[PDB]
Design a protein around this motif. Sequence first.
Motif, PDB file in Angstrom:
ATOM      1  N   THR A  12      69.731 -12.733  34.439  1.00  0.00           N
ATOM      2  CA  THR A  12      69.866 -12.570  35.882  1.00  0.00           C
ATOM      3  C   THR A  12      71.320 -12.374  36.286  1.00  0.00           C
ATOM      4  OG1 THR A  12      68.054 -14.166  35.960  1.00  0.00           O
ATOM      5  CG2 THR A  12      68.950 -13.401  38.050  1.00  0.00           C
ATOM      6  N   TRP A  13      72.255 -13.027  35.591  1.00  0.00           N
ATOM      7  CA  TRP A  13      73.667 -12.784  35.868  1.00  0.00           C
ATOM      8  C   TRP A  13      74.050 -11.350  35.534  1.00  0.00           C
ATOM      9  CZ3 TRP A  13      75.101 -15.581  39.368  1.00  0.00           C
ATOM     10  CH2 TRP A  13      75.000 -16.976  39.381  1.00  0.00           C
ATOM     11  N   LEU A  14      73.533 -10.823  34.421  1.00  0.00           N
ATOM     12  CA  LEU A  14      73.772  -9.423  34.090  1.00  0.00           C
ATOM     13  C   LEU A  14      73.182  -8.507  35.152  1.00  0.00           C
ATOM     14  CD1 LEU A  14      74.739  -7.176  32.293  1.00  0.00           C
ATOM     15  CD2 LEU A  14      72.741  -7.523  30.834  1.00  0.00           C
ATOM     16  N   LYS A  15      71.985  -8.838  35.640  1.00  0.00           N
ATOM     17  CA  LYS A  15      71.429  -8.134  36.790  1.00  0.00           C
ATOM     18  C   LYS A  15      72.370  -8.211  37.983  1.00  0.00           C
ATOM     19  CE  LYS A  15      69.127  -8.840  40.885  1.00  0.00           C
ATOM     20  NZ  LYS A  15      69.288  -9.883  41.937  1.00  0.00           N
ATOM     21  N   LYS A  16      73.066  -9.334  38.137  1.00  0.00           N
ATOM     22  CA  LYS A  16      74.091  -9.507  39.152  1.00  0.00           C
ATOM     23  C   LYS A  16      75.452  -9.004  38.686  1.00  0.00           C
ATOM     24  CE  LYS A  16      74.463 -12.923  42.862  1.00  0.00           C
ATOM     25  NZ  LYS A  16      74.329 -14.365  43.204  1.00  0.00           N
ATOM     26  N   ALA A  17      75.480  -8.185  37.631  1.00  0.00           N
ATOM     27  CA  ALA A  17      76.715  -7.631  37.077  1.00  0.00           C
ATOM     28  C   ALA A  17      77.691  -8.731  36.669  1.00  0.00           C
ATOM     29  CB  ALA A  17      77.373  -6.653  38.052  1.00  0.00           C
ATOM     30  N   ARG A  18      77.176  -9.759  35.998  1.00  0.00           N
ATOM     31  CA  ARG A  18      77.995 -10.862  35.519  1.00  0.00           C
ATOM     32  C   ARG A  18      77.655 -11.155  34.068  1.00  0.00           C
ATOM     33  NH1 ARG A  18      81.083 -12.064  38.957  1.00  0.00           N
ATOM     34  NH2 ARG A  18      82.004 -13.587  37.511  1.00  0.00           N
ATOM     35  N   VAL A  19      78.683 -11.451  33.278  1.00  0.00           N
ATOM     36  CA  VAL A  19      78.537 -11.742  31.857  1.00  0.00           C
ATOM     37  C   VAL A  19      79.067 -13.144  31.597  1.00  0.00           C
ATOM     38  CG1 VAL A  19      79.192 -11.104  29.521  1.00  0.00           C
ATOM     39  CG2 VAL A  19      78.691  -9.327  31.202  1.00  0.00           C
ATOM     40  N   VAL A  20      78.243 -13.977  30.962  1.00  0.00           N
ATOM     41  CA  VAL A  20      78.631 -15.350  30.672  1.00  0.00           C
ATOM     42  C   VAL A  20      79.748 -15.356  29.638  1.00  0.00           C
ATOM     43  CG1 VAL A  20      77.754 -17.637  30.125  1.00  0.00           C
ATOM     44  CG2 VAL A  20      76.225 -15.914  31.094  1.00  0.00           C
ATOM     45  N   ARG A  21      80.749 -16.202  29.858  1.00  0.00           N
ATOM     46  CA  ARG A  21      81.844 -16.334  28.909  1.00  0.00           C
ATOM     47  C   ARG A  21      81.353 -16.956  27.606  1.00  0.00           C
ATOM     48  NH1 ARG A  21      86.064 -19.079  33.265  1.00  0.00           N
ATOM     49  NH2 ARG A  21      86.356 -17.217  34.574  1.00  0.00           N
ATOM     50  N   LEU A  22      82.104 -16.713  26.535  1.00  0.00           N
ATOM     51  CA  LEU A  22      81.745 -17.248  25.230  1.00  0.00           C
ATOM     52  C   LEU A  22      81.846 -18.767  25.223  1.00  0.00           C
ATOM     53  CD1 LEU A  22      83.688 -14.688  23.003  1.00  0.00           C
ATOM     54  CD2 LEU A  22      81.344 -14.544  23.874  1.00  0.00           C
ATOM     55  N   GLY A  23      80.846 -19.415  24.629  1.00  0.00           N
ATOM     56  CA  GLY A  23      80.848 -20.853  24.478  1.00  0.00           C
ATOM     57  C   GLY A  23      80.529 -21.641  25.729  1.00  0.00           C
ATOM     58  N   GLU A  24      80.114 -20.985  26.809  1.00  0.00           N
ATOM     59  CA  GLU A  24      79.810 -21.690  28.047  1.00  0.00           C
ATOM     60  C   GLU A  24      78.621 -22.623  27.853  1.00  0.00           C
ATOM     61  OE1 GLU A  24      81.175 -21.997  30.892  1.00  0.00           O
ATOM     62  OE2 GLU A  24      82.655 -20.387  31.059  1.00  0.00           O
ATOM     63  N   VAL A  25      78.746 -23.843  28.364  1.00  0.00           N
ATOM     64  CA  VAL A  25      77.679 -24.837  28.284  1.00  0.00           C
ATOM     65  C   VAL A  25      76.643 -24.548  29.363  1.00  0.00           C
ATOM     66  CG1 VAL A  25      79.182 -26.569  27.264  1.00  0.00           C
ATOM     67  CG2 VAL A  25      78.940 -26.439  29.754  1.00  0.00           C
ATOM     68  N   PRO A  26      75.370 -24.870  29.136  1.00  0.00           N
ATOM     69  CA  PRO A  26      74.351 -24.668  30.177  1.00  0.00           C
ATOM     70  C   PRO A  26      74.503 -25.698  31.287  1.00  0.00           C
ATOM     71  CG  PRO A  26      73.378 -25.695  28.249  1.00  0.00           C
ATOM     72  CD  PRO A  26      74.780 -25.318  27.863  1.00  0.00           C
ATOM     73  N   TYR A  27      74.810 -25.219  32.494  1.00  0.00           N
ATOM     74  CA  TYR A  27      74.950 -26.124  33.630  1.00  0.00           C
ATOM     75  C   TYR A  27      73.626 -26.810  33.947  1.00  0.00           C
ATOM     76  CZ  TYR A  27      77.331 -27.808  37.848  1.00  0.00           C
ATOM     77  OH  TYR A  27      77.915 -28.592  38.814  1.00  0.00           O
ATOM     78  N   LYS A  28      72.525 -26.061  33.904  1.00  0.00           N
ATOM     79  CA  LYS A  28      71.191 -26.625  34.058  1.00  0.00           C
ATOM     80  C   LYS A  28      70.258 -26.012  33.030  1.00  0.00           C
ATOM     81  CE  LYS A  28      70.347 -29.930  36.926  1.00  0.00           C
ATOM     82  NZ  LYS A  28      69.883 -29.605  38.304  1.00  0.00           N
ATOM     83  N   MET A  29      69.594 -26.869  32.266  1.00  0.00           N
ATOM     84  CA  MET A  29      68.545 -26.455  31.345  1.00  0.00           C
ATOM     85  C   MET A  29      67.214 -26.676  32.052  1.00  0.00           C
ATOM     86  SD  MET A  29      71.319 -27.806  30.374  1.00  0.00           S
ATOM     87  CE  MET A  29      70.792 -29.503  30.616  1.00  0.00           C
ATOM     88  N   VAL A  30      66.565 -25.582  32.443  1.00  0.00           N
ATOM     89  CA  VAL A  30      65.416 -25.658  33.339  1.00  0.00           C
ATOM     90  C   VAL A  30      64.236 -24.898  32.749  1.00  0.00           C
ATOM     91  CG1 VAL A  30      66.862 -25.965  35.378  1.00  0.00           C
ATOM     92  CG2 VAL A  30      66.175 -23.659  34.659  1.00  0.00           C
ATOM     93  N   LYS A  31      63.125 -24.865  33.480  1.00  0.00           N
ATOM     94  CA  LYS A  31      61.924 -24.207  32.984  1.00  0.00           C
ATOM     95  C   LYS A  31      62.136 -22.701  32.912  1.00  0.00           C
ATOM     96  CE  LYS A  31      57.684 -25.766  33.719  1.00  0.00           C
ATOM     97  NZ  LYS A  31      58.452 -26.570  34.709  1.00  0.00           N
TER      98      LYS A  31
END
Length: 52
Positions: A12-31
């Motif tokens: 969804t971030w890529l859909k929002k033209a965003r790429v997660v940085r390397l090694g980023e921790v999951p802020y929320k682990m959800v369903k």
Amino acid sequence: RDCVHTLHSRDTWLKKARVVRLGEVPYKMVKGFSNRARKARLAEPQLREEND
DNA sequence: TGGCATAGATATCGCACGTCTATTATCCTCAGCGCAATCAGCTGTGACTACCT
């Protein structure tokens, strides 16, 4: 509230033209729910909570 | 006279019961290839006739 933040999936971030940085921790682990994922989780409920 | 239990009066928060539009990968169609008995043309062989001896 300024400490409360909204989150999206990496896809969804890529859909929002965003790429997660390397090694980023999951802020929320959800369903997680997608067609194949939804059918697999309906097949067995033990991993429905375990997807996260 | 005065301390305070004991229930009348009242909301109050939690558990449970209705809808709603999408945190992400389908269903038919036409053009492009393929496979197996005719049919026809390239090539081989015999019949007819020219030329050197």
